[PDB]
Amino acid sequence: MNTPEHMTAVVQRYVAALNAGDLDGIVALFADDATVEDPVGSEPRSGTAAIREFYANSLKLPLAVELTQEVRAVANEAAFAFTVSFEYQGRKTVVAPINHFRFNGAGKVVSMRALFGEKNIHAGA
Amino acid sequence: MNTPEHMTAVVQRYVAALNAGDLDGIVALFADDATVEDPVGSEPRSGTAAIREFYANSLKLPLAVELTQEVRAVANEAAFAFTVSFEYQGRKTVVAPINHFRFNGAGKVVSMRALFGEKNIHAGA
Ligand SMILES: C[C@]12CCC(=O)C=C1CC[C@@H]1[C@@H]2CC[C@]2(C)C(=O)CC[C@@H]12
Ligand SMILES: C[C@]12CCC(=O)C=C1CC[C@@H]1[C@@H]2CC[C@]2(C)C(=O)CC[C@@H]12
Numbered sequence: 001m002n003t004p005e006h007m008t009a010v011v012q013r014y015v016a017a018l019n020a021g022d023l024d025g026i027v028a029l030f031a032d033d034a035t036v037e038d039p040v041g042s043e044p045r046s047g048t049a050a051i052r053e054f055y056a057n058s059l060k061l062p063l064a065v066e067l068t069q070e071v072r073a074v075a076n077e078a079a080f081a082f083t084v085s086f087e088y089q090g091r092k093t094v095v096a097p098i099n100h101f102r103f104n105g106a107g108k109v110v111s112m113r114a115l116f117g118e119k120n121i122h123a124g125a
Numbered sequence: 126m127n128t129p130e131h132m133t134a135v136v137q138r139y140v141a142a143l144n145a146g147d148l149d150g151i152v153a154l155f156a157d158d159a160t161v162e163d164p165v166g167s168e169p170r171s172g173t174a175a176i177r178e179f180y181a182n183s184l185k186l187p188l189a190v191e192l193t194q195e196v197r198a199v200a201n202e203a204a205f206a207f208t209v210s211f212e213y214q215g216r217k218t219v220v221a222p223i224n225h226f227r228f229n230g231a232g233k234v235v236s237m238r239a240l241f242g243e244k245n246i247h248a249g250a
Contacts, residue, residue: 004242041200068194069206072223074242075166079223081194081206098197098204098223100240115225117129117199 002107004073010109011071011080011101018058018065018084027052031108038114039097061086068096076103093123127232129198135234136196136205136226143183143190143209152177156233163239164222186211193221201228218248 010029017025027048030036035044036051045054064085071080079100086093097116101109135154142150152173155161160169161176170179189210196205204225211218222241226234 004244008244039199040202070221070245072221072240072242072245074164074240077165077240079204079225079240081223096195096197098206100204100225115197115199115202115204117197119129119133120195120197 002076002103002105004078006107007073007076007078007101007103008071010103010107011067011073011078015065015067015082018063021059021062023052023055023059026055029109030112031104031106031110034109035111038099038112039117040113040115061088076105077101078103091123091125093121096120096122127201127228127230129203131232132198132201132203132226132228133196135228135232136192136198136203140190140192140207143188146184146187148177148180148184151180154234155237156229156231156235159234160236163224163237164242165238165240186213201230202226203228216248216250218246221245221247 014026014029030051032048034051035046036054037044045051065082067080067082069081071078079098081098084095095116097114097120099112099114102111104110139151139154155176157173159176160171161179162169170176190207192205192207194206196203204223206223209220220241222239224237224239227236229235
C-alpha cells in the first residue's frame with residue numbers, strides 16, 4: 001500500500017500539523033508502537049502516549065516549520081530537510097535538521113529520527 | 126576522538142573526492158568492515174574491496190557533486206543534502222539525494238546510506 005507519493009504527503013502533513021500545533025494530526029501519522037528519537041543521540045520515546053507528550057512539549061512555543069528542499073522517499077523510508085523557527089525573550093532561532101521516517105506497509109511511521117547539531121541551530125545573541 | 130567538526134569535514138572530503146574521481150580518497154574515509162547501501166532499499170556492499178568496486182562503477186562518468194545545504198552532524202552521525210550531476214548521450218541529469226553516515230569512535234565511516242527516489246532524479250527527455 002505504501003508508495004513514495006504517500007510518504008511525501010505524510011511529510012507534508014507532518015510539517016503542516018507542527019505549524020498548526022495540531023498535536024493530534026501529528027500523532028495519527030505514527031504506528032501504535034512507533035519510536036521518536038529527537039535529537040539523534042538522545043533517548044527514544046516509545047508508543048502513542050510518549051510520542052504525544054514529546055510533541056506537546058515541542059509545541060509550547062508557536063513553531064514556524066517549512067520544508068526547504070524536496071522530500072527524498074524510496075522503499076519504505078523518507079528523509080527531509082527543513083527549518084523550525086521560534087522566538088523567545090526576543091531572540092529568533094532557526095533550527096535546520098534533517099529528519100528520517102521509516103514506514104510500515106500500512107503507511108504509518110514506525111520510527112522518526114531528527115539529526116541536527118549545535119552548528120544547525122542558528123540564533124543571534 | 127570524533128566530533129561534529131570532524132564528521133562535517135569528512136563529508137566535505139567525500140564530496141570533493143567524488144568530483145576529483147579520487148577513488149582512493151573516498152575509500153580511506155571508510156572503516157575496513159564498513160557497509161554502503163546506495164540506494165536505500167538495495168543490497169548493502171560490505172568491506173573495502175566491495176566499497177571500492179561500488180565507487181569505481183559510480184565514477185565511470187565524470188560527476189559534478191555539490192553540497193546544497195549545511196551538513197547536519199551530531200553524536201556519531203552526519204546527514205547531508207547534495208546533488209550529483211552528469212551528462213550521457215546529451216541528456217543532463219541531476220540526482221538529489223540525502224545521505225547518512227555513521228562513524229566509529231576512530232572517526233571512520235562504518236555505514237553509508239543514500240536515500241533518493243525516482244522523483245529525486247531530475248532530467249529532461
Ligand atoms: C522536535 C522538533 C520539531 C519536530 C521535528 O521533527 C524535529 C525537531 C528537532 C528540532 C526541535 C523541534 C522541537 C522544537 C525544538 C526542540 C527547539 O525549541 C530547539 C530544537 C527544536
Ligand atoms: C552513488 C552516488 C554517488 C555517491 C553518493 O554518495 C550517493 C549516490 C547516489 C546517486 C548515485 C551516485 C552514483 C551515480 C549515480 C548512480 C547515477 O548515475 C544515478 C544515481 C547516482
